[PDB]
């Protein structure tokens, strides 16, 4: 074996990302968990030497096991190897010298798309405030980012509206690459997002390009239901797993177009080989928007 796939996590950390820790001033906490948190912060001199810049900083608590500490470094290396993309919460810098590792990423002023839809749900119109054309753009942008991930042999493993952020110009970005993996055939694997997971992920812990496509289909349902929870009225229990295995699927949300719901049904196919690729999803949605 003289040819091998270059493992992004095995590559050395590039010190081009290194940013002085004392030049960050922390603000409100954006997200919190048992392992760590993400805070809004001000970076002085990050892009321009004399200009302060609003950023988000992902950090672990000192009471963190070594597996979580290297998971944060692995996410940092994935984001650097992946490269910049418009539909990704892009890496801006890192603070690895001595102190606790800090990962500086883009700040999205509007927050997660799930909470955004629930705010705008009361004042939504299909045609003339959130509109239908916004929903089509959001599904198109997230598909491009996922297609970009899949084009780098990478899976996200936690695709959902809560992990899609909105920023200026109605640009959506995929965030939280903590569970992102480089598949090169599939990846086999904590609390899991069962209602977004493909059946093969629930039953055999297998994660693929196709399992991301399943989660994308669940995301489209979140999108066109104006932020409702998936499988409403069904708790994650023994009956839930049985109905999924047998072929139960959510019906079309109220505002979903027929060709958008058609994508959801192909995303939710029991056979992964019959699920569409993200590249196919982009062209389908792209044709839709021009015809719109
Ligand atoms: C008006 N408004 C604006 C925002 C907003 C919110 C973000 C954001 N996210 C915040 C939420 N996220 C996130 N991710 C991972 C975790 C953890 C708990 N699992 C974690 C944390 C650290 C760690 F070391 C390991 C795990 C928590 N929270 C994703 C990023 N990023 C950028 N801008 N932004 C802007 C929210 N309201």
Residue numbers in the entry: 566 to 693, 763 to 818, 821 to 825, 829 to 931
The authors write:
Avapritinib is the only potent and selective inhibitor approved for the treatment of D842V-mutant gastrointestinal stromal tumors (GIST), the most common primary mutation of the platelet-derived growth factor receptor α (PDGFRA). Furthermore, we report the identification of a sub-pocket (Gα-pocket) located in the N-lobe of the kinase domain, which is surrounded by amino acids of key regulatory elements such as the Gly-rich loop and the αC-helix.
Intense screening and optimization resulted in two complex structures with avapritinib in wt and gatekeeper-mutant KIT-T670I. In contrast, in the T670I-mutated kinase, this position is occupied by the isoleucine side chain, and no water-mediated contact can be observed. Based on their MD simulation, Winger et al. suggested that the T670I mutation confers resistance via distant conformational changes within the Gly-rich loop, which we cannot confirm based on our complex crystal structures.
